Amino acid sequence: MRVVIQRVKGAILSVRKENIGENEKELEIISEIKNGLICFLGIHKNDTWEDALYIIRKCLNLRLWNNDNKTWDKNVKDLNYELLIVSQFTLFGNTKKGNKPDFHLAKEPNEALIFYNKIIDEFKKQYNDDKIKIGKFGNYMNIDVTNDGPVTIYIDTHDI
Amino acid sequence: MRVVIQRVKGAILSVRKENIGENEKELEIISEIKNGLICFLGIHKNDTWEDALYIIRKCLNLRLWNNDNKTWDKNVKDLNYELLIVSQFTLFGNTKKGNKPDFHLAKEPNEALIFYNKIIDEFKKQYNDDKIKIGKFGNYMNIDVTNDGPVTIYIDTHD
């Protein structure tokens, strides 16, 4: 259960609907966040719940903000910021056997679609029903991010 | 080391304008790219040239683009796209211990600064210096990246 956490000042996610005939035309915003964190989540072939849990816990408790004199002192909650959880199986795409990725590791669609939603859901029970946003699982997405720092953090819930 | 690669349509890197000369405050641009790759690279305390050499490869080589009825077929060099590599120790922010990340596992600022240049040099060599861009090592930066997809890949040269 891999994730990429990027501390950002803002973030605007958008998708495409259909009907354009120009060369990549007609983009639509469906969500965005001001100050906070954006998370790139990938679901593994054999992930359980305890996995999803570690993720959420961390995303909501890492003290990635310098506050006053001290550094690394505040979590996204403390400063009342938002989070943008985005599905991303690219993560498990293996690149050890040639220049063409191998997602054979990833968790198949229908089965993951549910898991994701399940998480996106729990990701509220642990913070604020209104501080979370999402992408659109199984869809092209465009995302403009304002990287603060910048700050990036990786976490594989298979290491521990 | 470890690298996080995202596919973008552009990226705008800015820093603080520490100008006590005739004014006060503000941030200015320094680097900027369009379609291509964004790479947050973290230099490990025990990183070899063999290590970097790898990232450079997988970076300048991975097929992360779709071309004429063909997905995952093209790579950065092929489409003649560019790269914006940014050094990021935090990528080595150990987080199992507490809620406050300890980077007591990431190579030191200078020892690591020169290793970062060497990489950025080889990159310009393994491709083309006009296609490689950077930022300001160790300073606060503001990066406005336009994530295309998204498509994020991760690699840990230590597997």
From Swiss-Prot, chain A:
Belongs to the DTD family. Changing residue 150 to A: Loss of deacylation of D-tyrosyl-tRNA(Tyr). GO terms for molecular function: D-tyrosyl-tRNA(Tyr) deacylase activity; Gly-tRNA(Ala) deacylase activity; nucleotide binding; tRNA binding. TRNA binds at residues 72, 89. The keyword Cell division does not apply. InterPro entries: Daa-tRNA_deacyls_DTD, DTD-like_sf. The gene is DTD. Gene3D superfamilies: D-tyrosyl-tRNA(Tyr) deacylase. The keyword Electron transport does not apply. Its EC number is 3.1.1.96. The active site is at 90 (nucleophile). PANTHER family: D-AMINOACYL-TRNA DEACYLASE 1, D-TYROSYL-TRNA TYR DEACYLASE. Pfam families: Tyr_Deacylase. This is D-aminoacyl-tRNA deacylase. It catalyses: glycyl-tRNA(Ala) + H2O = tRNA(Ala) + glycine + H(+); a D-aminoacyl-tRNA + H2O = a tRNA + a D-alpha-amino acid + H(+); D-tyrosyl-tRNA(Tyr) + H2O = D-tyrosine + tRNA(Tyr). Changing residue 90 to A/S: Wild-type deacylation of D-tyrosyl-tRNA(Tyr). It comes from Plasmodium falciparum (isolate 3D7).
